[PDB]
Amino acid sequence: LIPLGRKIYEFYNAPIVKFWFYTLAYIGYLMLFNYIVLVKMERWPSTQEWIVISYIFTLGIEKMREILMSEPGKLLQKVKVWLQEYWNVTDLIAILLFSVGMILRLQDQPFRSDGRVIYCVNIIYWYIRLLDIFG
Amino acid sequence: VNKYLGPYVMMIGKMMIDMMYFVIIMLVVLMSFGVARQAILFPNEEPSWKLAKNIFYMPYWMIYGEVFADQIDPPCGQNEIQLPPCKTGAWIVPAIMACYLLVANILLVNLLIAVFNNTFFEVKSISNQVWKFQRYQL
Amino acid sequence: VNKYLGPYVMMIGKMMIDMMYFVIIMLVVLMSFGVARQAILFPNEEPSWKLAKNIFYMPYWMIYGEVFADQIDPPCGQNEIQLPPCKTGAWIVPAIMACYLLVANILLVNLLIAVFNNTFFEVKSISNQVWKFQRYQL
Numbered sequence A: 001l002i003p004l005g006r007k008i009y010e011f012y013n014a015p016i017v018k019f020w021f022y023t024l025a026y027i028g029y030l031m032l033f034n035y036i037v038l039v040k041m042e043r044w045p046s047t048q049e050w051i052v053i054s055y056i057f058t059l060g061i062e063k064m065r066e067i068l069m070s071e072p073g074k075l076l077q078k079v080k081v082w083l084q085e086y087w088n089v090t091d092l093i094a095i096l097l098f099s100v101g102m103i104l105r106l107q108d109q110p111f112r113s114d115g116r117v118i119y120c121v122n123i124i125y126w127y128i129r130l131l132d133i134f135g
Numbered sequence B, C: 001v002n003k004y005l006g007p008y009v010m011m012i013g014k015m016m017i018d019m020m021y022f023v024i025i026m027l028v029v030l031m032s033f034g035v036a037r038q039a040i041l042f043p044n045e046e047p048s049w050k051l052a053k054n055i056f057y058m059p060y061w062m063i064y065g066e067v068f069a070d071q072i073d074p075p076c077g078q079n080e081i082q083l084p085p086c087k088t089g090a091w092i093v094p095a096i097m098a099c100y101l102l103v104a105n106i107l108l109v110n111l112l113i114a115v116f117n118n119t120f121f122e123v124k125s126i127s128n129q130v131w132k133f134q135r136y137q138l
């Protein structure tokens, strides 16, 4: 059983396996975003929208962890060296936009439609961000 | 079998791969504009396969000179007959349509022109030589 | 007779051959789409020469920015007044239209751009020298 566990641990820590797992999760998240923007939403979010919100929140926590686990000591230098990549800047802008849209959506009308609109502009961004996977 | 048509045919077959990569990038941009337009203009929809059709329908014919000009920004919320009320954020649909049409028709088609043009000579020489090779098989 | 218009005219005459080969491949793809569209959308037809006209009519103008958007996929078998029952396989026509428009407008026109650009220099030098030779005949 020990060689089987060694094979499992060696497979799941490979960078190609991690990349394909990230790619499949991103494609599934994008598909769920498509379902929650095409179909109507009620007063409370559905299960698919809760999965999309969880994806956004955990991605934001992961980007914060990438900010904290960097090379400089002083925090402004870590923020500056993380914002030197344009994709990190657009990721931060999109996560803040999703937060604003979800806050507006969790209220009543007419703010729910505003959150829906912000969701549509964000799905434009994530569809463009598929080129990171294509890279 | 013809000395000019044959290498032309396999040259078309060689540029099919560059056309395929172009189709992949156009599929990404087209699907973004279709999803955004359908999701803004139609908020209250049941789960139906017509939504998937409406993702692809109008943005695809927008590449070939049909912008569907009556549906860019139709007058709404106005007595003219009081036209139906405007949906929220419907002004973003012509803006993202402008960005989509610009990116598609001006960037990706011209980029496919450029990659067809700069790889033409090697493909033409290899296609002529491979046709002269396949004369034996014929 | 003009030093710039004359070489331009015989340069056009040189590119007519590449235009002819493009016309042949366009004719194959155009007739395939026209025959398929006419034979699917019109099942019960008598022998008439209008069928041959309908093969070439709308697919040819589809190359020049007129996609006939009212006839791509009209609502059928539905109250608009109930529309005529949808012909069997009528959904195949927009798909093969998509494939035809992609192949024609994006592949073959850009390929003709590629064959016009990479044979331009030899044709231009030959046309200039031939015009300078034919000055004596003029």
Ligand SMILES: CC(C)CCC[C@@H](C)[C@H]1CC[C@H]2[C@@H]3CC=C4C[C@@H](OC(=O)CCC(=O)O)CC[C@]4(C)[C@H]3CC[C@]12C
Residues within 6 Å of the ligand: A024, A025, A027, A028, A031, A032, A035, A048
């Ligand atoms: C690994 C990658 C390449 C693919 C992973 C994504 C799919 C497995 C997911 C993404 C979108 C999902 C769909 C999104 C929405 C719905 C509607 C859902 O129906 C309802 O919510 C209403 C009825 C009910 O409550 O069951 C049933 C599941 C389904 C088809 C999901 C099935 C599973 C899908 C296709």
Ligand SMILES: CC(C)CCC[C@@H](C)[C@H]1CC[C@H]2[C@@H]3CC=C4C[C@@H](OC(=O)CCC(=O)O)CC[C@]4(C)[C@H]3CC[C@]12C
Residues within 6 Å of the ligand: A025, A026, A028, A029, A032, A047, A048, A051, A055
């Ligand atoms: C990790 C993410 C980014 C993608 C992984 C794909 C699947 C693990 C997910 C995607 C869509 C999900 C489905 C979306 C919608 C539903 C309907 C849902 O129906 C109800 O909850 C009905 C009862 C109720 O209303 O509470 C049951 C779970 C299910 C099938 C989900 C099961 C898990 C699915 C297939």
Ligand SMILES: CC(C)CCC[C@@H](C)[C@H]1CC[C@H]2[C@@H]3CC=C4C[C@@H](OC(=O)CCC(=O)O)CC[C@]4(C)[C@H]3CC[C@]12C
Residues within 6 Å of the ligand: B009, B010, B011, B012, B013, B014, B016, C029, C032, C033, C096, C097, C099, C100, C103
């Ligand atoms: C009405 C609609 C559906 C029009 C049909 C579109 C496609 C089904 C056709 C149009 C042009 C065809 C291509 C024209 C030229 C060639 C080259 C030829 O292949 C070779 O000569 C082999 C060597 C080589 O590929 O270079 C046959 C396949 C291919 C790619 C053809 C595959 C089928 C294509 C894409």
Ligand SMILES: CC(C)CCC[C@@H](C)[C@H]1CC[C@H]2[C@@H]3CC=C4C[C@@H](OC(=O)CCC(=O)O)CC[C@]4(C)[C@H]3CC[C@]12C
Residues within 6 Å of the ligand: B023, B024, B026, B027, B030, B053, B056, B057, B060, C073, C074, C075, C076, C086, C090, C091, C092, C094, C095, C098, C102
């Ligand atoms: C990125 C580019 C190069 C390719 C992406 C575009 C295609 C994948 C899309 C564009 C037009 C679409 C078609 C538009 C309309 C229809 C009709 C539809 O059938 C019906 O709606 C039934 C009949 C009816 O209800 O009127 C089936 C899908 C289909 C063929 C679509 C299939 C997908 C197509 C070919």
Ligand SMILES: CC(C)CCC[C@@H](C)[C@H]1CC[C@H]2[C@@H]3CC=C4C[C@@H](OC(=O)CCC(=O)O)CC[C@]4(C)[C@H]3CC[C@]12C
Residues within 6 Å of the ligand: A027, A030, A031, A032, A034, A035, A038, B047, B048, B049, B051, B052
């Ligand atoms: C990265 C790219 C390739 C993502 C592409 C995503 C969309 C094109 C797909 C993914 C999930 C699909 C949805 C999954 C489930 C459904 C439910 C489905 O509902 C039914 O068929 C009715 C159910 C019944 O009554 O039996 C209608 C299509 C729809 C909305 C699908 C529409 C097309 C979606 C949004």
Ligand SMILES: CC(C)CCC[C@@H](C)[C@H]1CC[C@H]2[C@@H]3CC=C4C[C@@H](OC(=O)CCC(=O)O)CC[C@]4(C)[C@H]3CC[C@]12C
Residues within 6 Å of the ligand: B020, B023, B024, B027, B048, B049, B050, B051, B052, B053, B056
């Ligand atoms: C990846 C590149 C190189 C090729 C392009 C592949 C896809 C973009 C195509 C191929 C098959 C297509 C699907 C074939 C059939 C349908 C059913 C169709 O359903 C209807 O139109 C339902 C009828 C109606 O409600 O009117 C909706 C589009 C869809 C999902 C098509 C969406 C576009 C797809 C996924």
Ligand SMILES: CC(C)CCC[C@@H](C)[C@H]1CC[C@H]2[C@@H]3CC=C4C[C@@H](OC(=O)CCC(=O)O)CC[C@]4(C)[C@H]3CC[C@]12C
Residues within 6 Å of the ligand: C009, C010, C011, C012, C013, C014, C016
């Ligand atoms: C009103 C409609 C029907 C438009 C008419 C279209 C054709 C009847 C014309 C348009 C451009 C003409 C061409 C323009 C230039 C030339 C070059 C010229 O030929 C030469 O100078 C001889 C040297 C050489 O061919 O290189 C005259 C024939 C040709 C092919 C012409 C043939 C007749 C064409 C195809």
Ligand SMILES: CC(C)CCC[C@@H](C)[C@H]1CC[C@H]2[C@@H]3CC=C4C[C@@H](OC(=O)CCC(=O)O)CC[C@]4(C)[C@H]3CC[C@]12C
Residues within 6 Å of the ligand: C023, C024, C026, C027, C030, C053, C056, C057, C060
């Ligand atoms: C592959 C490309 C480069 C060339 C292929 C296209 C032509 C060969 C086609 C496209 C338009 C066709 C024309 C479209 C309409 C007509 C009118 C038609 O006359 C009538 O229908 C009589 C008057 C009437 O009944 O209204 C005679 C054929 C003709 C000239 C067609 C002849 C063949 C044409 C020129």
Ligand SMILES: CC(C)CCC[C@@H](C)[C@H]1CC[C@H]2[C@@H]3CC=C4C[C@@H](OC(=O)CCC(=O)O)CC[C@]4(C)[C@H]3CC[C@]12C
Residues within 6 Å of the ligand: C047, C048, C049, C051, C052
């Ligand atoms: C490889 C490519 C170029 C082949 C193209 C073939 C078709 C475009 C042609 C060849 C056979 C033709 C058909 C041959 C016979 C007839 C019968 C003809 O009937 C009449 O004229 C009526 C008889 C009468 O009352 O006198 C009408 C045209 C039609 C359908 C023709 C329409 C055009 C067709 C299908």
Ligand SMILES: CC(C)CCC[C@@H](C)[C@H]1CC[C@H]2[C@@H]3CC=C4C[C@@H](OC(=O)CCC(=O)O)CC[C@]4(C)[C@H]3CC[C@]12C
Residues within 6 Å of the ligand: C023, C024, C027, C049, C050, C052, C053, C056
């Ligand atoms: C090979 C390339 C380089 C040149 C293109 C040649 C053909 C594609 C053209 C030239 C003569 C054309 C034909 C000339 C006259 C007619 C009669 C025309 O008859 C009608 O329109 C009948 C009236 C009606 O009912 O509308 C139908 C098209 C047709 C067969 C044309 C079909 C297309 C043809 C064969």
